[PDB]
Design a protein around this ligand. Sequence first.
Ligand SMILES: CCN(CC)C(=O)c1cc(-c2cc(N(C)C3CCN(C(=O)c4ccc5c(c4)nc(C)n5-c4ccccc4)CC3)nc(NCC3(CC(=O)NC)CCCCC3)n2)ccc1F
Ligand SMILES: CCN(CC)C(=O)c1cc(-c2cc(N(C)C3CCN(C(=O)c4ccc5c(c4)nc(C)n5-c4ccccc4)CC3)nc(NCC3(CC(=O)NC)CCCCC3)n2)ccc1F
Ligand SMILES: [Ca+2]
Ligand SMILES: [Ca+2]
Ligand SMILES: [Ca+2]
Ligand SMILES: [Ca+2]
Ligand SMILES: [Ca+2]
Ligand SMILES: [Ca+2]
Ligand SMILES: [Ca+2]
Ligand SMILES: [Ca+2]
Ligand SMILES: [Ca+2]
Ligand SMILES: [Ca+2]
Lengths: 602, 602
Amino acid sequence: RERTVRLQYGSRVEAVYVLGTYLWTDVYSAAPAGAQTFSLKHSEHVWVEVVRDGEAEEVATNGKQRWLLSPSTTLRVTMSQASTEASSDKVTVNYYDEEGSIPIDQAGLFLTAIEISLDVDADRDGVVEKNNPKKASWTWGPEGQGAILLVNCDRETPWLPKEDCRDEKVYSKEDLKDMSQMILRTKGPDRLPAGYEIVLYISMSDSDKVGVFYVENPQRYIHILGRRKLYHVVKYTGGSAELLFFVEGLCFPDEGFSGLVSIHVSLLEYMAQDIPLTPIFTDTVIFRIAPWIMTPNILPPVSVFVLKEVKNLVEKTNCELIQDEIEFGYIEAPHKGFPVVLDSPELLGPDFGYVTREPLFESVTSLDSFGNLEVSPPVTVNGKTYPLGRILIGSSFPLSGGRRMTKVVRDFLKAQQVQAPVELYSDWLTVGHVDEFMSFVPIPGTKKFLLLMASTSACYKLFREKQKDGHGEAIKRITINKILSNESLVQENLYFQRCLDWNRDILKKELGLTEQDIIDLPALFKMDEDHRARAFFPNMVNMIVLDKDLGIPKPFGPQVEEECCLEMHVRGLLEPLGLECTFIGTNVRRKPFTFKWWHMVP
Amino acid sequence: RERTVRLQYGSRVEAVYVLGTYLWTDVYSAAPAGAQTFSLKHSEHVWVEVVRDGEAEEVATNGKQRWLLSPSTTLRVTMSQASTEASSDKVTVNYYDEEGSIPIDQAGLFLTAIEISLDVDADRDGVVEKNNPKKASWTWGPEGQGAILLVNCDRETPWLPKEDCRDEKVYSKEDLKDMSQMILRTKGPDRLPAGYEIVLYISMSDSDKVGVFYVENPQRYIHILGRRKLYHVVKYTGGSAELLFFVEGLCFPDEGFSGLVSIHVSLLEYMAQDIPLTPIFTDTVIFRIAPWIMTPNILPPVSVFVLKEVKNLVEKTNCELIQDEIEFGYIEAPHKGFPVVLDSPELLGPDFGYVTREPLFESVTSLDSFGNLEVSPPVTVNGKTYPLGRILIGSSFPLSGGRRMTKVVRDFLKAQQVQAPVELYSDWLTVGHVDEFMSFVPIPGTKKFLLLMASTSACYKLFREKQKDGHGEAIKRITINKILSNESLVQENLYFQRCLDWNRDILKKELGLTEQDIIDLPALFKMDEDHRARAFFPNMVNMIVLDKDLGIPKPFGPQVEEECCLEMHVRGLLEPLGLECTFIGTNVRRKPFTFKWWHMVP
Ligand SMILES: CCN(CC)C(=O)c1cc(-c2cc(N(C)C3CCN(C(=O)c4ccc5c(c4)nc(C)n5-c4ccccc4)CC3)nc(NCC3(CC(=O)NC)CCCCC3)n2)ccc1F
Ligand SMILES: CCN(CC)C(=O)c1cc(-c2cc(N(C)C3CCN(C(=O)c4ccc5c(c4)nc(C)n5-c4ccccc4)CC3)nc(NCC3(CC(=O)NC)CCCCC3)n2)ccc1F
Ligand SMILES: [Ca+2]
Ligand SMILES: [Ca+2]
Ligand SMILES: [Ca+2]
Ligand SMILES: [Ca+2]
Ligand SMILES: [Ca+2]
Ligand SMILES: [Ca+2]
Ligand SMILES: [Ca+2]
Ligand SMILES: [Ca+2]
Ligand SMILES: [Ca+2]
Ligand SMILES: [Ca+2]
């Protein structure tokens, strides 16, 4: 920051100097008529250079030296410590005529040096460091830097109809733990010279994305910037001082909002009461509002929201106790984080947040329900790494006039960025959800997961062996022989295997999977009036994954032995990998990724 | 592209194979009840591998070999040249039971290999190369790649009320020179197997950004994709074939449109007449729509739009013959480019294009007029390079309730990206334009330019020397002595010098300038009723820059000699750098940067 401060003909000019800047001072155009030359004195804590045509040249406090007055001869003025009274530090310039060794005129510059810094935790360790030089940027990765801000979308105070960020008030110091800290640090004399004030400010646009709070009597809570407050004039305190503000996020990254926001402080010179002039200094900090993050099946379960055997299966973990209403995610900053639940178009408590997106022109379908919303385990895809996974959403083809999740949920999910969503084809299903045909399961040593796919061809292959084994009479009276000889039903399932393979191909491509990673599970569909699939027997892939325990729907199909040839087959596949199958809607809150989302690389 | 193609129990499956992909074929789940093992034959141009648990293993066309039937035993099928009749190439699989050395059943795969490529000039040399592997991306810089598309914002046909891109019709082959070429290249037998078609398509959203044209009888011009045409079914021609399409841009990069657009081709399998199934293949090309670019003063003039001495000054260049209505820019692709004029809220000819942006809710001010719109010479700013310069726009401070150029022109200018706009402070001026206080001028050997700034302090410094020289009577009867002793007027100009220095500081910072690069020109302002500045004498910095000839307003102030102490002073500064001053609204169309905008680096 090089800033212009001209000397004024015959006058003494008072200026405030902010440490970290330097002044360029025109001496020439202040010089009286007929001067040929100037000297200068300057005080201890002012560094002064004289500068002709690039050629810098420092000067002592006391020298009697003269130079030749030219427009190419200017000064550069620095100061290296704040002032303890106003003025005191100074630079004075003498102008001497052709001979005359007494100055004809003089011009001065009376400086008060102050330090002003607007500080945040840009290095992301939870401590608000002193003027991080990257605080005005935001970059990704471990070596990256820039401060993070949560949406205050929980509720500290239960009497309250809405989430904290919904008002412009704070009713509890518990709240401030959800907020990011920003400290205005100043260092100067005991009052500002006349006609200066310090003003925090934000843009009209950011004014619905942030709220800033001052803690008075640290106690009362003052809303200074935010909704309908774009600026706040700050009381300067002298000497070394710190003001503490608390910043809350109000909106998630979304269509038309990247999640970056700015807060500024200006030292504004005035010409009067009102008549503001120009900022003589500005400092800026950036916050990135932290995205909403979903949790996959490979992540350890903490609590299962659910009659009888759901409870009994969960006693083998240390979990507590519709899938279509709710998706559990979280939000995380270096300081704080907490579960936040997305709501399909009120567990709203302390440290349990809430988002919805309601359509406006558009209307909801079955594809909006959050069984149509899943996320992979972490993956690498041609080198790019997805440490938090990829969100998966069932769709229809774009020209097919079929169904689609609302744009407003879709844009929301895209806007979060860190789980780079992938669209699948679920609209061949009557309900239309990705959870009807695919699931992930961890392999309990690793680090490594499996994709489970429904497969009609595996089902026909299984039955043709059973009919061969003579279990064709194994059972409105449904036997294998009965199904196998149903030609019409066979066609439908060839068409459904086609839909399943389309998705198989997307999933492999976008999650970097191979056939090694995929288990096909036998499954069978009947075509409804719309030509869409609905399950024929209980849909086994549509399970609960409580670690290594799998809560798999009970098939009850054409059976043999004292159990079933489907429960034997599915047990045969999963159990030899580590996984304990229990055969029996639910919805499991999980442990966050230990992986911090801000370390993610572009 | 790995794609799924299952064998079908007992059946022969016909498939189309697109070169560049590979198939994964499940053999297991097709195998009859009781098989233990399979062999396979395959034709010459089919490459087949057998794959157990990762372990690939190629197989000959004729071998009698058996393998053990398992779900982990699949095939991988490739083909390396197109087919000349349908089927012909094939893979057949034999299934043998426990002993029996004659196959019990068999399943086949009858492949027709075709080549389909949607091709563009992604390497940016004007020739449409064969399947550039980066054609589906767009990257910046010299080593960067991705195809470029002009907005067709000129007019080939003058009877027409609007610019070409405004309809969905082409009335002249001249037009196609403004368009980008895209070639669907196919290679296959003489007909497609039954139930396949090729479909070009675009998104609803891109459908108002692109128009695509087919030249029939190469002649008639067919609109295939664009406004209200999202898809086009293409006639396959057999053998080695090329279809040529022409693509026109319709909209400039803008708020909410990055300037990237996509066009796709799918091979779509059908189950019937209608009943489309799934794309078995998709190829995608990306275009970046080329931005609108402004031209600075250091660039050579081609024609001056203007009573008497404007004409006489221009005869010293080889130029042809309000500044507030119009800004000359251009647009450039590797193939084509042409001047386009931005219109403040009809030189619309062949190779002379047009854009406007009209506000909607907002209304115009003086700051909308394009004297409030300039651009620097190329600059480097802390390493970042601005090879085309930076657009400069006069503004007011954000909290000041002052004037501002319309958001819609501002967003438009930002959206173009390559001249990263900078806002200045012009609202202290009655009119409010950047051209009232600053100009650039080339230094005629280089490569190097100067910033000229209006300066009230230089003016007072000049007069104080004239009054000293006793020219205080040099001249409603205005003399130097008269001005100097006007105290009220002195104050106003101290305040205006303050506004000028604010801008000086922005300009230095954002154009990486130093005092070395700046000439202050003497200037004087009177404060109007709104406290805003209007010039006192003719505003000299507000000049025409026709190379080394400067067309400088004639000052006519307090004079001496047979001319003026202001025309002597300004001549004294400029002429010793190379520049021929002529003292005398205009608007000069210039030579584009030789620098291609796509080579610019992020
Ligand atoms: C170019 C690819 N692309 C861009 C990425 C797409 O967006 C895309 C679009 C479609 C699609 C499907 C569709 N339809 C009507 C579906 C058929 C399958 N669906 C069924 O309802 C269905 C499913 C199975 C059945 C049954 C109907 N009837 C029978 C008898 N079966 C059956 C099948 C097997 C066994 C037993 C029964 C669901 C809707 N209609 C249209 N129309 C758009 C079109 C113009 C047009 O024709 N408009 C009326 C024609 C296709 C060309 C683009 C222009 N597109 C399909 C795949 C796609 F990739
Ligand atoms: C914090 C910095 N910032 C964020 C980046 C800004 O956007 C910013 C805002 C202003 C600004 C100017 C302004 N005004 C009224 C201008 C005074 C200069 N202008 C004149 O019209 C003008 C100029 C010269 C004159 C004369 C009036 N009257 C006289 C006598 N002179 C004069 C001066 C020298 C010689 C002779 C005459 C033009 C408008 N009014 C308000 N109001 C906003 C505010 C609330 C408020 O007071 N609202 C009513 C107060 C400032 C604090 C933020 C809240 N802001 C100025 C600089 C800024 F950088
Ligand atoms: Ca820190
Ligand atoms: Ca609140
Ligand atoms: Ca809270
Ligand atoms: Ca909380
Ligand atoms: Ca879900
Ligand atoms: Ca090329
Ligand atoms: Ca047209
Ligand atoms: Ca044209
Ligand atoms: Ca043209
Ligand atoms: Ca202009």
